[PDB]
């Protein structure tokens, strides 16, 4: 097998910018190198074949170069639609082999998260479960921390976090945090807090409810 390596897996750039993504092969592949775009929904599109030739339909701001073992994809005048993962592939021998891909994030103005907390539902409690939930919606940059406090005491165990993909239109991220305990644990304590710590603010954003209300 020819091993294909993309040394950079993550890339963050601004609209209009020019980005270069590099690909390296374990042996000489004589320019039989192709480039593909995988959108977050999994759809895959051919961009460039044989190092530098454009596949039909592809905008001219995509271009490629290289020889021997080293190859590069260049995307200039970077577009909001280009949020994707970009894969290379050697076309010289079987099995056809692919690079690990480079993910591309489009930069955006910093935005603080709109935070919301919800108590366990009527129905869930009857089932004997109790999930407290927190949405931290429409923020940038992605990096963010959530802290749960039950009656003021921090809770690390039994918490599930889930980030969305970068929003394809506005470039924001959203995240849900979910604390799951038993009904009896839940009913032993009064206050439940959700604390968001993000670059946009020096002090955390705090939302909570009290059961005695």
């Amino acid at each position: 097998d020819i091993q294909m390596t993309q040394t950079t897996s993550s890339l963050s750039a601004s609209l209009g910018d020019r980005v270069t993504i590099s690909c390296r092969a374990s042996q000489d592949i004589s320019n039989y190198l192709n480039w593909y775009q995988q959108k977050p929904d999994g759809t895959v599109k051919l961009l460039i074949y044989y190092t530098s030739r454009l596949h039909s339909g592809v905008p001219s701001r995509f271009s490629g170069s290289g020889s021997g073992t080293d190859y590069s994809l260049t995307i200039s005048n970077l577009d909001q639609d280009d949020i994707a993962t970009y894969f290379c592939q050697q076309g010289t021998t079987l099995p056809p082999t692919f690079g690990g891909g480079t993910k591309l994030e489009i930069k955006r103005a910093d935005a603080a998260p709109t935070v919301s907390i919800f108590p366990p539902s009527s129905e869930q409690l009857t089932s004997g479960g109790a999930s407290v939930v927190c949405f931290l919606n429409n923020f940038y940059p992605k990096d963010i921390n959530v802290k749960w406090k039950i009656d003021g005491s921090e809770r690390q165990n039994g918490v599930l976090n889930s980030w969305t993909d970068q929003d394809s239109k506005d470039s924001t991220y959203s995240m849900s945090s979910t604390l799951t305990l038993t009904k009896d644990e839940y009913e032993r304590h009064n206050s439940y807090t959700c604390e968001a710590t993000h670059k946009t603010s020096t002090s955390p954003i705090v939302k909570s409810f009290n059961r005695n209300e």
């Binding site: 010289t92 079987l94 099995p95 907390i117 919800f118 999930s131 919606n137 889930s162 959203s174």
Partner: protein
């Protein structure tokens, strides 16, 4: 106008065989080209499995040749993948693709991908819980409501919303495995002057279990 789409079961038990079909339209699988099976495992690492050429010639990735078989039905313009003795390692997104038969070796059309899960776990419908603000939680300009879809298997699940105003931003959070089972959630934001005045309900479909539930959101 060439199109490929893969189909077949989304859940297979360990040690059994995985079977998939790729249906080709707008082009004939006998005219030219090679017809490929590929797969992408957890961690985004893409792997070629094999092809059947337009002339019936077949080749396989050496890592899989012991367990794999690709066939075609030129009558239905379909080609098929069978992979035997599957384990959890064979859990992946499976793709079909058309490529050059040699020359530049480029895959010019791809199917959208189908997800196959290899587990002995049982197919379970989801519990659907409403997410409404607490009673003393007086708000402002708009209101965020949600649904919690917990304790189902396998993936996937679709959450759709109905409210009344087309100023609804929806977010769908990817599912996570909570001790054998999946949990996900979805949020919707509507103006505060439309809720609780206008009814808001979420719809949760789970095709594996062929179930659909609707939760109305209550203040």
């Amino acid at each position: 106008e060439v199109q490929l789409q893969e189909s077949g079961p989304g859940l297979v038990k360990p040690s059994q065989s995985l079977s998939l079909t790729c249906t080709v339209t707008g082009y004939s699988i006998t005219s030219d080209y090679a017809w490929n099976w590929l797969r992408q495992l957890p961690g985004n690492k893409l792997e070629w499995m094999g092809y059947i050429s337009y002339s019936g010639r077949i080749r396989y990735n050496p890592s899989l040749k012991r367990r794999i078989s690709i066939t075609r039905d030129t009558s239905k313009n379909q080609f098929f993948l069978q992979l035997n003795s599957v384990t959890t390692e064979d859990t992946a997104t499976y793709y079909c693709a058309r490529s050059d038969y040699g020359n530049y070796g480029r895959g010019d059309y791809w199917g959208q991908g189908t997800s196959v899960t290899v587990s002995s776990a049982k197919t379970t419908p989801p519990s659907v819980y409403p997410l409404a603000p607490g009673c003393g939680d007086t708000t402002g300009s708009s209101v965020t409501s949600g649904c919690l879809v917990k304790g189902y298997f396998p993936e996937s699940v679709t959450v759709t919303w109905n409210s009344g105003s087309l100023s609804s931003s929806v977010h769908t959070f990817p599912a996570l495995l909570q001790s054998g089972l999946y949990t996900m959630s979805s949020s919707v934001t509507v103006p505060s002057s439309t809720w609780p005045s206008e009814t808001v309900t979420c719809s949760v479909a789970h095709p594996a279990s062929s179930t659909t539930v609707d939760k109305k959101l209550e203040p």
